């Protein structure tokens, strides 16, 4: 369902946990097979640049399975890209003008905060 | 509550009337204080109100030569990218178009959430001031970049698709390329290999689509090479493997041109620059830098935090000014409505509490 | 205190005569003191009520009547809009009441603002919330009373599978 490429590692000790709020910098982008070297990565659909760093609590469900249990194998400060096939993302019913069915999401991502504690 | 933030300014809600769009001093002509804060104020225009001023434009521009020959003083400006509220700053800074001759070397829309304010409001610029603005083509005044990225998504949301194609016509009008002050050739991308005399520029059909292939191709989308000014190998032009198309061309390929055309710089944009601008090596005939990047769009996508300048050339000399971004609006992704956005994640909330009552 | 018509709730509802019992037993689960009705308290004792970001929408979305507790036939009422023998149009409704605190029909600026801010917290800032808010009532307002009717709303989410969203699979 889910890959993670890490590109920098984070500290190795701090890791996020069920029911930790996280706090996260990403671009999110759909898959684009045309592209490796880009790491897969097509059209931009959203971003943390354009609006602020992301917060959810993690482990619950309240986001895409592939973050779910991807961002629990993460450590404070690492930057990876997440390779999210889409019955681990909004599957067949997608995001209504956003994202298509059955698509792939490739997400850069940065794990900048786990509770109190910042990369 | 009726509202909760009073301190952020409300858009303009309502289309101006015809009695508004129209200018009090030239009732032939859009009054451009009023469309210039009602884009400010993220405003609309009625269907009509846009068309007609596109197709103005259009009027305008196919009339004009694929070569462009203007004098100093003027202001040279980059890209924009539908970063309308840096538009404004890039005007402050470059001087008031009532009293100031400016030429754009193109890539007004994409990227940027407020393209077709940017296109709307220089459109109208150009319909006042047809003989001291001029307005050229960039790679992406076309429809294939405008499919790929947001300008289509854009007038689809705001106007209509009968928009975007009076849109897609009139950029097919945008001349190709300048001479400004008889000194130098300006233009969105770069040289060619097909680009020989200025005579090239003027045989182009430009009034369609931009082609895969060719000189039409290479004067949007060419860049200099990486290593511009300290090549090894003697090449003029190899193929750009970071557009995919067209090609990189070298210092020598730069000094070749200059001296063949009398030329003293080619001023060219396309390439973000950090400090908004780049000066390449000057040529050993004159001590003009060969080549100038010029880049309009200050923080780049909300992302690189560059630097914009624009290129103010009067009594010879040529002063950059540089800007700083300004803060915009905000939209959700693809500009989606707020109800659409928090509905599905609104049926997860619901549903998880309605389970745990009854589970 | 009270007394109801078993036979009425079931008519006036999805719901069959089963399920109206199955609904009573948790009813009277949710309803701790014996009371007959669900006091507030007893929604939020409810962890995963009390954590959940809409968890007073919810409540005072039962609470049809606004008394400030919920009675069984509020209980069905409330639940009845997401049956999967449910329509469109009421489930549309469900959707349209999480906005319009004030229950009068209309989703204004600032309605719209709170319900969204207890869903997305610091991830937007209120500058940038307030403005896709208001750009939103600027594309939905089709009579320019700056507020959102109910043909206002249906006509903004048609693209959404709502009925999807407002269905509960098992009772
Ligand atoms: C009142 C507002 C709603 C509220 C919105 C925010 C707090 C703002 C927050 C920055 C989201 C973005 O807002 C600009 C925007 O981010 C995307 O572009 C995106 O990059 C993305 O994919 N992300 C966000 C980062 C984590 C992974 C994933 C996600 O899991 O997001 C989650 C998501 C949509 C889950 C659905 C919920 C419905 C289930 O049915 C479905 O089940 C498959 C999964 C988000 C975080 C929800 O927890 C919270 C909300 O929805 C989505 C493509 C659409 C999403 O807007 C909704
Ligand atoms: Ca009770
Ligand atoms: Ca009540
Ligand atoms: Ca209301
Ligand atoms: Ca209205
Ligand atoms: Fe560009
Ligand atoms: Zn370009």
Same mark, same amino acid.
């Given at each position: 369902?889910?890959?993670?490429?890490?590109?920098?590692?984070?500290?190795?000790?701090?890791?996020?946990?069920?029911?930790?709020?996280?706090?996260?910098?990403?671009?999110?982008?759909?898959?684009?097979?045309?592209?490796?070297?880009?790491?897969?990565?097509?059209?931009?659909?959203?971003?943390?640049?354009?609006?602020?760093?992301?917060?959810?609590?993690?482990?619950?469900?309240?986001?895409?399975?592939?973050?779910?249990?991807?961002?629990?194998?993460?450590?404070?400060?690492?930057?990876?890209?997440?390779?999210?096939?889409?019955?681990?993302?909004?599957?067949?019913?997608?995001?209504?003008?956003?994202?298509?069915?059955?698509?792939?999401?490739?997400?850069?991502?940065?794990?900048?905060?786990?509770?109190?504690?910042?990369? | 509550?009726?509202?909760?933030?009073?301190?952020?300014?409300?858009?303009?809600?309502?289309?101006?009337?015809?009695?508004?769009?129209?200018?009090?001093?030239?009732?032939?002509?859009?009054?451009?204080?009023?469309?210039?804060?009602?884009?400010?104020?993220?405003?609309?225009?009625?269907?009509?109100?846009?068309?007609?001023?596109?197709?103005?434009?259009?009027?305008?521009?196919?009339?004009?030569?694929? &070569?462009?020959?203007?004098?100093?003083?003027?202001?040279?400006?980059?890209?924009?990218?539908?970063?309308?509220?840096?538009?404004?700053?890039?005007?402050?800074?470059?001087?008031?178009?009532?009293?100031?001759?400016?030429?754009?070397?193109?890539?007004?829309?994409?990227?940027?959430?407020?393209?077709?304010?940017?296109?709307?409001?220089?459109?109208?610029?150009?319909?006042?001031?047809?003989?001291? &603005?001029?307005?050229?083509?960039?790679?992406?005044?076309?429809?294939?970049?405008?499919?790929?990225?947001?300008?289509?998504?854009?007038?689809?949301?705001?106007?209509?698709?009968?928009?975007?194609?009076?849109?897609?016509?009139?950029?097919?009008?945008?001349? &190709?390329?300048?001479?400004?002050?008889?000194?130098?050739?300006?233009?969105?991308?770069?040289?060619?290999?097909?680009?020989?005399?200025?005579?090239?520029?003027?045989?182009?059909?430009?009034?369609?689509?931009?082609?895969?292939?060719?000189?039409?191709?290479?004067?949007?989308?060419?860049?200099?090479?990486?290593?511009?000014?300290?090549?090894?190998?003697?090449?003029?032009?190899?193929?750009?493997?970071?557009?995919?198309?067209?090609?990189?061309?070298?210092?020598?390929?730069?000094?070749?041109?200059?001296?063949?055309?009398?030329?003293?710089?080619?001023?060219?944009?396309?390439?973000?620059?950090?400090?908004?601008?780049?000066?390449?090596?000057?040529?050993?005939?004159?001590?003009?830098?060969?080549?100038?990047?010029?880049?309009?769009?200050?923080?780049?996508?909300?992302?690189?935090?560059?630097?914009?300048?624009?290129?103010?050339?009067?009594?010879?000399?040529?002063?950059?000014?540089?800007?700083?971004?300004?803060?915009?609006?905000?939209?959700?992704?693809?500009?989606?409505?707020?109800?659409?956005?928090?509905?599905?994640?609104?049926?997860?909330?619901?549903?998880?509490?309605?389970?745990?009552? &009854?589970? | 205190?009270?007394?109801?018509?078993?036979?009425?709730?079931?008519?006036?509802?999805?719901?069959?005569?089963?399920?109206?019992?199955?609904?009573?037993?948790?009813?009277?689960?949710?309803?701790?003191?014996?009371?007959?009705?669900?006091?507030?308290?007893?929604?939020?004792?409810?962890?995963?009520?009390?954590?959940?970001?809409?968890?007073?929408?919810?409540?005072?979305?039962?609470?049809?009547?606004?008394?400030?507790?919920?009675?069984?036939?509020?209980?069905?009422?409330?639940?009845?809009?997401?049956?999967?023998?449910?329509?469109?149009?009421?489930?549309?409704?469900?959707?349209?009441?999480?906005?319009?605190?004030?229950?009068?029909?209309?989703?204004?600026?600032?309605?719209?603002?709170?319900?969204?801010?207890?869903?997305?917290?610091?991830?937007?800032?209120?500058?940038?919330?307030?403005?896709?808010?208001?750009?939103?009532?600027?594309?939905?307002?089709?009579?320019?009373?700056?507020?959102?009717?109910?043909?206002?709303?249906?006509?903004?989410?048609?693209?959404?599978?709502?009925?999807?969203?407002?269905?509960?699979?098992?009772?």
């Amino acid at each position: 369902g889910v890959t993670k490429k890490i590109l920098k590692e984070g500290n190795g000790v701090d890791k996020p946990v069920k029911g930790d709020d996280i706090v996260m910098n990403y671009r999110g982008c759909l898959y684009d097979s045309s592209k490796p070297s880009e790491h897969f990565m097509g059209r931009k659909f959203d971003s943390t640049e354009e609006r602020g760093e992301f917060k959810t609590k993690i482990g619950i469900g309240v986001v895409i399975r592939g973050w779910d249990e991807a961002v629990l194998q993460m450590s404070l400060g690492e930057k990876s890209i997440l390779t999210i096939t889409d019955d681990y993302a909004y599957g067949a019913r997608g995001f209504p003008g956003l994202i298509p069915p059955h698509a792939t999401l490739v997400f850069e991502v940065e794990l900048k905060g786990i509770n109190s504690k910042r990369a | 509550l009726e509202r909760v933030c009073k301190e952020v300014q409300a858009p303009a809600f309502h289309t101006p009337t015809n009695e508004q769009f129209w200018s009090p001093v030239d009732p032939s002509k859009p009054n451009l204080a009023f469309l210039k804060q009602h884009f400010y104020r993220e405003g609309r225009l009625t269907e009509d109100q846009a068309l007609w001023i596109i197709q103005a434009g259009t009027e305008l521009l196919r009339a004009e030569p694929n &070569l462009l020959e203007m004098d100093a003083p003027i202001t040279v400006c980059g890209d924009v990218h539908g970063q309308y509220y840096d538009l404004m700053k890039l005007f402050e800074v470059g001087g008031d178009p009532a009293e100031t001759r400016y030429l754009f070397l193109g890539d007004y829309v994409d990227r940027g959430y407020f393209s077709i304010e940017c296109v709307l409001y220089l459109w109208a610029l150009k319909i006042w001031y047809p003989n001291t &603005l001029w307005l050229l083509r960039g790679n992406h005044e076309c429809r294939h970049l405008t499919d790929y990225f947001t300008f289509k998504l854009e007038c689809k949301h705001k106007y209509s698709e009968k928009v975007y194609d009076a849109c897609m016509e009139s950029f097919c009008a945008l001349p &190709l390329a300048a001479i400004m002050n008889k000194q130098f050739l300006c233009i969105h991308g770069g040289l060619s290999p097909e680009l020989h005399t200025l005579e090239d520029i003027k045989s182009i059909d430009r009034f369609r689509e931009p082609p895969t292939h060719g000189l039409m191709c290479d004067i949007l989308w060419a860049d200099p090479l990486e290593d511009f000014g300290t090549e090894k190998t003697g090449e003029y032009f190899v193929h750009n493997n970071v557009r995919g198309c067209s090609f990189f061309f070298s210092y020598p390929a730069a000094c070749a041109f200059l001296e063949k055309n009398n030329l003293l710089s080619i001023i060219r944009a396309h390439e973000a620059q950090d400090a908004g601008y780049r000066m390449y090596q000057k040529t050993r005939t004159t001590g003009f830098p060969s080549v100038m990047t010029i880049f309009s769009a200050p923080n780049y996508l909300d992302v690189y935090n560059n630097k914009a300048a624009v290129l103010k050339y009067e009594n010879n000399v040529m002063n950059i000014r540089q800007f700083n971004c300004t803060p915009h609006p905000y939209w959700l992704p693809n500009f989606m409505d707020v109800f659409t956005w928090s509905l599905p994640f609104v049926g997860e909330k619901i549903t998880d509490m309605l389970i745990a009552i &009854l589970n | 205190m009270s007394s109801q018509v078993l036979n009425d709730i079931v008519s006036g509802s999805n719901f069959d005569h089963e399920e109206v019992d199955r609904l009573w037993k948790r009813f009277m689960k949710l309803d701790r003191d014996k009371s007959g009705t669900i006091e507030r308290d007893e929604f939020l004792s409810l962890p995963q009520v009390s954590s959940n970001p809409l968890s007073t929408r919810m409540i005072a979305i039962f609470d049809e009547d606004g008394g400030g507790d919920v009675d069984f036939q509020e209980f069905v009422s409330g639940l009845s809009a997401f049956s999967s023998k449910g329509n469109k149009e009421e489930k549309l409704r469900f959707a349209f009441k999480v906005y319009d605190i004030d229950r009068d029909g209309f989703i204004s600026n600032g309605e719209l603002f709170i319900v969204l801010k207890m869903m997305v917290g610091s991830n937007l800032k209120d500058m940038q919330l307030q403005q896709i808010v208001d750009k939103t009532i600027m594309e939905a307002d089709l009579d320019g009373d700056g507020r959102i009717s109910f043909e206002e709303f249906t006509r903004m989410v048609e693209n959404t599978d709502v009925s999807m969203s407002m269905t509960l699979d098992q009772f």
